[PDB]
Every structure is written in C-alpha cells, then in structure tokens.
Symmetry: D2
Subunit: 332 residues, 4 copies
C-alpha cells in the first residue's frame, strides 16, 4: 500500500517534519501508563513516546494503546529503549524507579532512584535540551532537585508533581464532608510530598467564602482540629492504598494530566508543585518542595512567595529540614 497510495494521493509537502506537542513518558509501569492514558484522554500530544528498559512490556503496552487510536487524537504512539525516539520533546514525564513496599517511606527509595536518574536525565537532556522535565518518581522533592542538578536546566523547566495530588486528596476529603464537588472547596497542601506536608489552614475557602464565614462556630480551633484529622488521612492515604492494592496509579495519572494540561496549553494556572524554595520560610539550603506555581508553556513562569502564618512557615521550614536530612547524604 505504501507503494500504491502513491497514485491516489498527491503529496503537496514532500517534507513531513517534527511534532509540535511531543510528549515522552519514561517508565511504562502502573504510574507511567496511567499518566500516558490520562495525557491521551486530554488530547495533549500529537506524538507520545514511551521509554523503559523492559523491551517486551514496552512493546505490549505500546501496542495496547496504539490499538485504541480510533478513539483518540494522538496520531503517533511509539515506544522503545533508545532515547533518540524522544528527540525534541516538549514535555518529559519521568515515572521510572522503585516504589514503596507496604509501610515503606518514600525517602527510602532515594538511593535506588538517584542511580536510575543518573542514567535517565543525561539521556533526556541529550535529545531534548529545551524540554520541560516533570518529575513524578519518589521521593519526588529530592529527585526534582537531582534532575535539576544533572540536567543543567533553568528552574522553570524542572518541575516535580509534588503536592498537586496531596491537595486534590485534601479537597476531596473536605468536600466529601460538606457534600459539594471538590472543585468548589479550596485548600492547598504544601511542603514535602510525604509525611511532613503542610496544610494551609489560613486559606480554606468554599466558592469565594472564607471557611470562617460559613458558621460562627468555625473558628481557628475548629479549623485546626478538622485539619489535624483530615491531614492525617491525607498523609496516610498512599500507605493504605499500597496495603490494599499494592500501589497507586489512577489519581496520580489524573494529577499529571492536570499539570500537563496547564503546561501544554499555556494556561497559567496555579499548582502546588516542587521547585526550589531556598530564600523562603527561613530555608537556606537548596531544598525543593511544593509551593504554588504558575504553569505554562515555559514551565514554571512564576513562583508565589506568600506571607503565611507563623505556624505554617515553621511547619514548612521543618518539612525542608526533613527533606535535607535525606538529601545531604546523596552523592552526585
């Protein structure tokens, strides 16, 4: 057919060329495939590239996706081990690495996944020097810092998925108690994507009403008690799902599709994602953790530098100390 379509088609552009929205996902595991599936459902890429080190699972996942192309708007889905396939990617989503066993801290994955990053990131930069890096692998705050150092990239193009998912979980749990859609409850989780994350009690809001304005009995103590209980469920959520299911995949897939949407579509939406926060909250080491960031086609265009409460800043400084305690021990 490649021989005979040459005479019921007139070619007007002898020069086919690159894709304008090429997205690469590294790692075709549970998280990688959920991210790729969410990115495809959002119609964000005209070319999707999958990279891994297990050839047979790579090819099977690729074929499975490819074969649903009737139902999608991504005309090129490709997969392999050779980073040449990723050349000139707009966005590279790194999901590769060790994941938590039951009861295991994300921080206990750091040495295994730094070693993996030492190989992945140089190869990414080689073929896509201008891409945005979106880090998902845990521990995400440390591996975003690591990716930043290994890549030589400016801060705007090295992003960790961070607390976008923790914040979505938090907003789900609170809106569940009220009986409204999570999109109309506003609250954010900042700091470590882990046990030391920080609820921003001062900013809880429903559809343009400060939480304190809903009811006379919703005072500072009520809010501290509520969030004490809700935040415990947030920090525990991943552990319980790992005990029950083995891993998490669907919610982070949706979160990464959310972040990719703002990045690819240049929306300048605000997300709590991992970036360098030296200079904020009394932090003086080169620690990355989640703060609100404006996202668009240049990556992080702006970082918020808010004036939060004394307690919130101190909890964030403590979160940075926890990260640094692990980060100081890695060798690059």
């Amino acid at each position: 057919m490649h021989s005979l379509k040459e005479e019921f088609l007139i070619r007007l552009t002898n020069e086919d060329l690159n894709a304008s929205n090429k997205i690469t996902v590294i790692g075709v595991g549970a998280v990688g495939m959920a991210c790729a599936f969410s990115i495809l459902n959002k119609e964000l890429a005209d070319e999707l590239v999958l990279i891994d080190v297990v050839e047979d699972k790579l090819k099977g996942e690729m074929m499975d996706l490819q074969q649903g192309s009737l139902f999608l708007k991504t005309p090129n889905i490709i997969a392999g081990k050779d980073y040449e396939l990723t050349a000139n990617s707009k966005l590279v989503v790194v999901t590769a690495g060790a994941r938590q066993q039951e009861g295991e801290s994300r921080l206990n994955l750091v040495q295994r996944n730094v070693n993996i990053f030492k190989f992945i990131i140089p190869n990414v930069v080689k073929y896509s020097p201008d891409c945005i890096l979106l880090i998902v692998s845990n521990p995400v705050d440390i591996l975003t810092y690591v990716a930043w150092k290994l890549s030589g990239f400016p801060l705007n193009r090295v992003i960790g998925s961070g607390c976008n998912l923790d914040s979505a979980r938090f907003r789900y749990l609170v809106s569940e108690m009220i009986g409204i859609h999570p999109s109309n409850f506003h609250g954010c989780i900042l700091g470590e994507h882990g046990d030391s994350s920080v609820p921003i009690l001062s900013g809880l809001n429903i559809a343009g009403m400060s939480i304190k304005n809903l009811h006379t009995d919703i005072d500072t103590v009520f809010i501290k008690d509520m969030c004490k209980d809700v935040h415990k469920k947030v920090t525990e959520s991943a552990y319980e799902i790992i005990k029950l299911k083995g891993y998490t995949s669907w919610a982070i897939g949706l979160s990464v599709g959310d972040l990719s949407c703002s990045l690819i579509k240049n929306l300048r939406k605000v997300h709590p994602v991992s970036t360098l926060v030296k200079g904020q909250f009394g932090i003086d080491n080169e620690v990355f953790l989640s703060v609100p960031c404006v996202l668009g086609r240049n990556g992080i265009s702006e970082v918020f530098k808010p004036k939060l409460t004394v307690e919130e800043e101190q909890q964030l400084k403590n979160s940075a100390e926890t990260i640094w305690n692990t980060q100081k021990d890695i060798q690059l």
Copy 2:
C-alpha cells in the same frame, strides 16, 4: 427510505420512547442561541427544543443548528411555537423578553417581561410539571420570583442565572491583573444581578491562599480599594458592551452552559444563583437574589446561609430593598 430501511434493519424495540435529557430553550434571540450553542457544545442534551413566537427566525435557527449535527452529540434538535414540543423537559431555560437599550436599567424591563412570563410559564408547567426552570431574562431576580409564583414549583426547581456571570466577570478582571487563569482566583458576587450587587471581600482567595496572605501590604483597606475599582467595572461591564455591540450573548451563553452542566450532570457544584433569601441578612420580604447554592439534578439541593461581615450583610440587605422597590409594583 423510511419505507426501504424496513428490510436492511431489524427493529428490536418497536417502542421508541422519550429522551432522558430533554432541554428546552425559550427565546431564539442572541442569548437563547448562545445558550443553546453552549448547551450543545457540552453535549448535555439528547433532545434540544427551541421555542419562540417568530416562526421564520425559529425555523432558520433550527435548521442552522441541525445542519451542524455531524459535529455534535444531540440527535434531536427541534423548534416551534407549540409548547407540546417541550413535554417532559428536564430543564427549561427562559431567555425571552425585552433587553436593555443603551443606558437602560435591567429593572426597566420588568413590566414588559412579567407580561411575557404570564404567558410562557403556565405553558411550560403544563407540559413539564417536573422540570427545572432556569431564568435568564432580565431583571433576572424579579422574574425568578415571578416564575416561582406563576409555576407553583418548589424552590429547588426555580433558579435564576443571577450572579454566576457577574462572578465570572469579577474573577476575570482580578486574575487579569495578577496574570493567572481565572479558575484559580476565587471571589464571588452576590445580591442583585445589577447595579446593587455585592462583592464578598472577606472571601477573596488564590488557589488556597487567602488574599491577605499574599503580601504584607494586602490589608483590609487595600482590598476595599481594589474591589471598589474592580466592582465598578463589573457593574458597568454590560452597559459598555451594549453601547459598543448592542447586546451581550457569549459570556452569558457560557455561564448558562456552566449552570446547566452542574444541573444535568448532578455535580453538586456551588454557584451564586438567584433564589429566595427571606430569612437571611435581615431580609423579610420574599426577595430572590444570588446566594451560593448547591446544584444538581433536583435543582438547588442546598442554599448556603453564611455569616458574612457586617458590611456585606448590610449591602445585601440594601440590594434586596432595591429589588423589592421595583418588585412591589408588579401585579400577579
């Protein structure tokens, strides 16, 4: 063909039946068609019915829409003057009536459009006793009250589009100054959909941060001054567009698609829409104005009764007095 498809098709259900998401738009003017177009783009209806009193414009608009059905997911688009077409509608959007001339207050449309409603609403109720009424016609707060009285409906199924659009305008103007997407700036406008509407200064928020927490200099006076200027632009917006363009259509079309989405899809999202607020803010007459409401397939499932600031409650009481000053003079 209706004769010959009878032998390359086997009918398995001799009994075709009603539509599950039948939506009627009354009025095929600028607002009605923008609403119908937005409802179609959201794929909310399997049957869309258009009602008006001008037969030729009715048929032309119907055909124009019908002919783009390849690109839509609404298999039945129909139009006419006979309310029998609307039978068993889930949702009825009323956009019919006089609109503002240059400089004209929405309240100056009340007698003309009450008279129009005296004919429309009884006919709607006759063929769709269980529908949700969504009132768009101005002055929207008074005509929602009027529709409530004429219909005999419970409060949950009589909704005015209210300040959903005013709030969208407000969030656009503020987020424009910051340089972020309006979806991440949270602020609401309540009260009259008109000159006496009320910005809720106490609830301004960016992506889970209270506005006061962005910068030490953002204090109560800064916020009052900012909103003084922004709110003036909000109340003026419709007048300027009417002077320049003759009318407004696109933003209210999108707003009504937003409200219809929450209603049809049962999302329990919160919108500032017009409902009865006797019993709130010191209001003791049967005044409708915009307060935050939970919307789903039963219409308004819940109304927020917030504890706003003294000034906000007083501005809302004044807004209700302004509405009542006009509403007391209509005869039903």
Copy 3:
C-alpha cells in the same frame, strides 16, 4: 465537626433523596474492569459509579485511588463492594469478571469457567437492576452474551456483547497507518466471532466517502488483527487499554442515546443461514434502549460463507455448555 456544622450552614430545599440518573456498574475490578471504569469516568458518563468484585481489599484500594482523583472528574459518587444492593437501579452494567487467556490460549477455552461465574453474577445483577442494559466484556464474549441473555431473561435489546467493536478499531488503525490518515476516516468492518474466526467485510471498505474502487493485503491485515491479542498477551500478559477505550465508546452511545452504529454481539439466528441461537458481531444501532436496530446486510458470497463458518465455530463450543 464539619459533618454537624454543614447541617446548620446549609439549608436543604429538597428532603427527597432521589436516585442517580446515570448509575453505571462495573463487575470485576481486574485489569479490564478498571480500564473500563477509568475510561467511563474520563467520559463523564456516570453520576454514580459502582465497582463490584469478590476481593475486598483490592476493591477498596481501587475505589480509594479513583475517589482521590475526584477533583479532576465529574462523577460525584464512586463506591465499591461485594453486595449487589450497591448496584440497585443501574442504567448500565458492564461485566468484565472472569478467567482470561494464558499465552496462546483460545478465548473459547474460558467459557465453562466463566459460565459458572455468570451463573452467580447475572441473577444478582437482574435482582437489583431489572431494567438495566447489560454490556458483556468477559470472554468468550459472544457465548457469554448468549449466556447472559438466557440467565437474565432480558429482551435482546438490553443484552449486548462488546464483540468486534475492538477488532474493528484495530483493523481501522492498521489500515490507516499504511495510508497515513487518521483511523476515524477509514471505514472497515470486522464481524463475526470476537476471536480467530472473525470476518473482514472487504466489500464495505471506504475512505471518507470514497469506496476502495474509487481509489489481497487487506486479508493480511485481518490476520494481524486476529493475532493481536495473542501477541500482547505474550508481551504484556493481558490487554486492557484498548478494550477500556472501546467500552467507553460503546457506553457513550448507550448513555447519551446517540443512535450510533457499532459491531457488537447480538442474536444472528435468521441471518447468513444460521438456524442456531448464535450470537456474534453484526452492526447495531445503540442508544438508551440498548440495541434499537440490527443491520441485515447483503454481503458477498465469500463474506456470508465466512460468517456462517464463524457461527459454526462458536456453536461448536456453545452447544457443549450446561446452563
């Protein structure tokens, strides 16, 4: 507590607690069931999604994982459990439960195992949603659609097998890659068994309103289609993403009442010389009543012979089933 204060800062206007209007149940939270659930959620088809299985822990873990992405969805209630009372009044029930293929194993070899599973599932589905649409995905999909019809007592319009919607998608993708166009503009039909004896309707091939004759190896492509599942199973262990997307496609047409045409499994006795109660894929019109119309196409002699053989291959396994 926020549970107690909401009782005071919200005024309920309705003391009615109606039922969801687009309640969708997925039976089986395996690889296929979750891919189906995820696609249905992405298409915003349900205001209530129910997941049923027999492994409590995996159920709850999958439910929690989906729930926690609710901010990015338009489905306000996601629930999971073992009790079919959770499924009551479902509009659509997608059955993905059962044994799946090992490497190189015919789908037909699964049938007696999955008949046994269906003898439990279907009567429990019908007890709580007697007016629902059944969409069968478990293999072998053509026989198990027949089984579901017999156990449920439903009319034929409300018992549908996912059939060759997926096989056709694969066919259209493969041909479209050779031409260099998007698969939605290549129109090619695969009918018959979802399996080794499927039939490409080469007489119907068309590009954007041009018949082939307006413009051998299309049999070669069909062979790649029949082998595709085996290849992926060998490489990956199973398939999930394409069938999830195909089920979401079918679900869209059913839930949104689109009257779209899909090659799905339904009774074809009376067509192509088939006198036994065999289900296989023919094109059907799908909407909120299920299959409203079935196409009676006049195919070539070779194509109707190939369909009769397909029916005989199915019947050869179906006839041995104790039901």
Copy 4:
C-alpha cells in the same frame, strides 16, 4: 495596586516572554467570524485568539464579551483590533470578512466585492505571519481561495478553503435522519463548488463500513443541500452556527495535526480533465503543515463529468476577475 504588588508576591523564573504556540487569528467579527471564534474557543485550540475587523466599536464589544467568559475557557489571551501587528506569528488565520448573500443571490455574485477586500487583507496577513495557514471562509469560497493563493504567494498546502466540509455535513445529516442513525456513521461525500454545482459522490456512500450495495432519492437529498443556505438566508437572513462548527472541525485537524480527511478547496488542475487553475473541493489530508495530501479519486463517468461542469461554472466567473 494589585499590578504593583504582583511584582513582589511572585518570583519570575523566566525573563523570556515567548510567543504563543497556537495563535489563531479570525479576520471579520461578523456573524460567521464570531461563530467561528466561539467554536474554536470551545475546542480549546488556541492559547491566543486575535480578532481583526474595521469597525472599532463592534470589535471591542465582541472582544469584551468573549473575554468575560474566560473563566469557562482555556484561552488565556483574547484580543481584538484593526492593526495586523496583533496577528503576528499566527499559526492559523481564518478569513471570514466580506459581503454575504442577500435572499436568492448566488455566492458567485459576491466575488468582485470580496476580491477587493482580500487585496487589502491577504498582504497584511502575510506581512506579519508569513508561515501561517490560511483558511478561507468568505464566499465564493472556491474562487477566493484561489485569490488568497495568488495574493499571498503561499504554497498550496497553506491555502485552504472551507469548501464542502459544510455541504458534506449537511448531506450526511439529511441522509442520517431518514435512516435513523447518527450522521457520523453515514459516509457521504459532496465535492466541487461550495454552491449550486456541487457533486454528490453517490458511488462512495457507506454506513459504518457497509457499502450501499451491501444494504434516485440521494439526488433529491443533494438538491435540499444546495438549497439549504438559500432557505436559511430567507428565514434568518444569514447562516452562522453550522459553518462555525465546520470551521472548528477543520481547525481541530490542522492545529492538532490529526491527518484527518476533509473535502476542502484546493487546486484541482490536472484532475477530471481540468486544465485551468480552478480550486474546488476534493478530499484532502489536514495537519499542522496544512494540506499534506490531496486525493486523486477515480469516480464514475457521471461524477467526473459533474465535477468538470462544476469547474467550468467556477471558471466562468473566475476568468472575469481582475487581480
């Protein structure tokens, strides 16, 4: 002020101020231009939408009305003005400006008026976006696509007329209503002039991969298609919604690089015995380079004769134009 404080509560990480990656310009903010703009906005195709016209007040009013719905959109910059510097570096330029039909008036009678308008528009477009794709909508679309090609000096792949994408949609809708299926599963092509001499490709008709022959009055339907615009113009004064949706459809394929097939206006010299530089609708493959491929179909004798006549009818008006 909030303008001054944002300078302090945000840290800029980029002092680069790049250019939008999907900048779309619509020339003409009349009924067609705004319906096109609204559909493009609903499809979230552009991060920057530019509206150009020559009536300052209506421009600003339409811009403000669109802008104020931004919360419900995914287009962060919407701008409008008279100055083509606003359009710089546009990926796609949709030209809807010009005279439209009065009741009963041939589209061909508009051409000399709209050629004059194009002699101003096109050189200004090309000055500021030399690499853009031109999508011509103004009537008569087939001649004005030729005109745009000649004035712009663009290659043929980047000068596209909306052509019979709309006429085909109308044809498919009308036939689909008689059968009772969704129009996306009926495949029928209308080629030639967007106008009175269009040509139904009855040899290519197909339902979901079944040729008609697998299953007179399809000429009757085509007559309803040619008359449809006149009827709506008589009833409503103009048309807008269907062409807006059709332009959004074409724009989707171009902007998202889908390689979908549409019947659009392009040069057909060398086909169907046409020796003049006539543009009319044939099926074309659309992506981010514009038209990458044009179909050379082998139609029936009656269909190629009907296309030649269509070409002659177009040429009869086109030959009289001073350019």
